[PDB]
Design a protein around this ligand. Structure first.
Ligand SMILES: [Zn+2]
Lengths: 121, 145, 182
RNA sequence: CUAGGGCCAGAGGCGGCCCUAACAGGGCUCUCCCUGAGCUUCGGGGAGGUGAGUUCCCAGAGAACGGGGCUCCGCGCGAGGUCAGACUGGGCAGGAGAUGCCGUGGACCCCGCCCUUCGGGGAGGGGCCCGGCGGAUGCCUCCUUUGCCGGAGCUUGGAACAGACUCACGGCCAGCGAAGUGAGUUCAAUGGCUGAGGUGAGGUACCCCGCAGGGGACCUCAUAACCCAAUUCAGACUACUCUCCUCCGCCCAUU
RNA sequence: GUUUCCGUAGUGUAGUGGUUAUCACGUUCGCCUAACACGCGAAAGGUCCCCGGUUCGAAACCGGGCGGAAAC
């Protein structure tokens, strides 16, 4: 994390720059796609382990980081057993499965909330 | 995965060309606070060799440029901030709405910081700028301009 | 020592203010209006043997998510009964364009049961364009607190950025999970 | 000494096709991946078969399989009530989505037409998944639950009918010291000079043809860079501009 | 003409059958001595010859371009 510390600033800058385009003018999303495509490529070559909370919004088909949150369809339904929150865009038509349930809040606090109590300085 | 990401293109359209270029200033304002958060020392005497070395791998998206030298006389003197950045071209948008494409073939760009001015010779800086931050910027040749 | 530096950015988009003195009696005001006008909602569904049915009461999660898309001025009421509800309720915060996302955390689960209705509804909303239902509820909308979103722009040409790098340690999960593969 | 050949084990042979004894050759074409300033029906680069093996740490049910974590389900097994539909009575499921509908999505099951009569190829339907739109009843008729067995899902991650790479798709056997290469040197010859042309710019007090135009004559200048034969030839790859042909991009200016 | 091998702090060289850059010499400092040669610890010092490509990540694997070296 000496030389790799510089690399963290170059990833969240292009992530935030795609939000500034869509905050001022929506329905023209070519800047939000390229800023996410450059963000994924730097993390692909310079290997970094990003959080699954942000990465589940990037919509790993090609690139859309903010587009399914305000334009596309994200709903709840029950396919076979437990209910699933299906995140599907309108460009590559790929889906991401995420189950929402009170029986597995202990496992729902396992990837994200366990690092909030164990990652010490 | 190759043609499926390239169905229409990731290219612009006709309607985002007229998005009132002064509204692209918070993209430049985001970049302006980004450089102050990168080195965090500017004023008294803080290593001008370090400033030109950290901008080698820095993502310069949304930065002001002005062509002071180019092999074409028509390319020299175009000001504006950039939006895309491809292999050996990068698309800029200028004053009152019109976009222009200037290639990175043999030219230099002038980037104005708060208290610094850095020239970027566009003949060595190419080859998919996401990979520019990764690796392989070595010492080769001169830039005869 | 196995320490992996992980860029972890859950930038906390906070909800409205937790004014328990203010957000308690306005829910009792909603019970005074939904009962005095009429309770013919269950009488048309069950048909225990039509003007109250004409409302577009967005009942459920997926009727609220389709409501805020096109062009609708409405009010959003979200409770917190699920602990991983931030996956679901992120659309309430992020779709702030023309609505007010009210979030009654401790009491809204106890507001469906006394009303003659159905089981525990998570997301409650209603479309009331070009129809005067209750003029007093429309006065509570500037009275409930709004939430600012620094995720996109927060309405001012001034960005909010941070550097949240949480280094993941393998020795912490070695004592919790105790999983070994050789 | 015809290697358009034989021998031992094999029986497998690199998408298909075509040209060549010049098969780490070229061309046509299909699919996929990587990638580029011609939205892209585009240019460039790489990979296609089968079998075996490998694929960091962490997270994750799982990175070969199985076991083990937890939920859901009953052509299975066991117990209790038997008070086995009463005013459709009883119980379960349901906005935390029941029911219904849509589809050039499936490498899923079945009916099944035609090419065919080995794997199979395409049109169409049902069931089961996938995804989308739209929101209220639906299920069973002695009943309910635990345990066991089977089936399905599982917020990870660069990746989970995978992809990438390595290895293997045979082994082995055949030469002549005799003069002199449209350059033939080997302590390693040879792309020379001058003058006149060609083509590519520029000019005319010059001539002819008479359509303002064109041709001829004369004068000035560019003709290179990369590089060197050593037995020879075909092909691939790489280093190139005095030049010509094809395909375009960017920006300036004009209408 | 012919064949194989090599390029790694300043030199000589390992290493890796792909995710970390180091051992010996020398320098600096430290240990030690009235001040020392040895022993010993530690630090400064990286275009891992160059580009492309494969892969999640090439000092490495592959392809090309040079370079260097061993001998008839
Ligand atoms: Zn998409």
């Amino acid at each position: 994390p000496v030389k790799d510390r510089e690399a963290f600033q170059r990833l969240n800058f292009l992530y935030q720059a795609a939000h500034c385009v869509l905050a001022q003018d929506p329905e023209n999303q070519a800047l939000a796609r390229f800023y996410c495509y450059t963000e994924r490529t730097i993390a692909k070559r310079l290997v970094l382990r990003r959080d699954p909370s942000v990465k589940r919004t990037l919509c790993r088909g090609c690139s859309s980081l903010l587009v399914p949150g305000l334009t596309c369809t994200q709903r709840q339904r029950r396919c076979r057993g437990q209910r699933w929150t299906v995140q599907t865009c309108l460009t590559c038509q790929r889906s991401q499965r995420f189950l929402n349930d009170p029986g597995h809040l202990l496992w729902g606090d396992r990837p994200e909330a366990q690092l909030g109590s164990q990652a010490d300085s | 995965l190759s043609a499926r990401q390239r169905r229409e293109l990731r290219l612009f359209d006709i309607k985002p060309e007229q998005q009132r270029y002064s509204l692209f200033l918070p993209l430049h304002e985001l970049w302006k606070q980004y450089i102050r958060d990168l080195c965090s020392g500017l004023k008294p005497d803080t290593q001008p060799q370090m400033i030109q070395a950290k901008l080698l791998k820095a993502d310069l998206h949304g930065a002001i440029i002005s062509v002071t030298k180019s092999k074409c006389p028509s390319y020299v003197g175009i000001t504006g901030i950039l939006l895309q950045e491809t292999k050996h071209i990068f698309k800029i948008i200028t004053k009152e709405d019109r976009l222009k494409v200037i290639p990175k073939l043999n030219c230099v760009f002038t980037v104005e910081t708060d208290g610094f001015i850095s020239y970027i010779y566009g003949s060595k800086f190419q080859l998919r700028s996401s990979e520019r931050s990764a690796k392989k910027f070595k010492a080769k040749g001169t830039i005869d301009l | 020592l196995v320490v992996k530096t992980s860029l972890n950015n859950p930038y906390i988009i906070r909800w409205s203010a937790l004014e328990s003195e203010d957000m308690h009696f306005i829910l009792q005001t909603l019970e005074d209006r939904l009962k005095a006008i009429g309770l013919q909602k269950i009488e048309d569904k069950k048909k225990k043997n039509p003007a109250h049915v004409r409302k577009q009461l967005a009942i459920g999660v997926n009727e609220v998510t389709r409501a805020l898309e096109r062009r609708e001025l409405l009010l959003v009421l979200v409770c917190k009964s699920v602990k991983p509800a931030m996956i679901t309720s992120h659309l309430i915060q992020l779709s702030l364009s023309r609505s007010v996302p009210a979030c009654q955390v401790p009491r809204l689960s106890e507001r469906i049961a006394p009303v003659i209705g159905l089981k525990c509804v998570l997301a409650l909303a209603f479309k009331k364009n070009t129809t005067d239902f209750v003029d007093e509820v429309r006065a509570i909308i500037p009275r409930v607190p709004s939430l600012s979103v620094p995720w996109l722009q927060d309405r001012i040409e001034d960005s909010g950025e941070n550097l949240e790098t949480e280094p993941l340690e393998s020795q912490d999960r070695e004592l919790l999970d105790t999983s070994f593969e050789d």
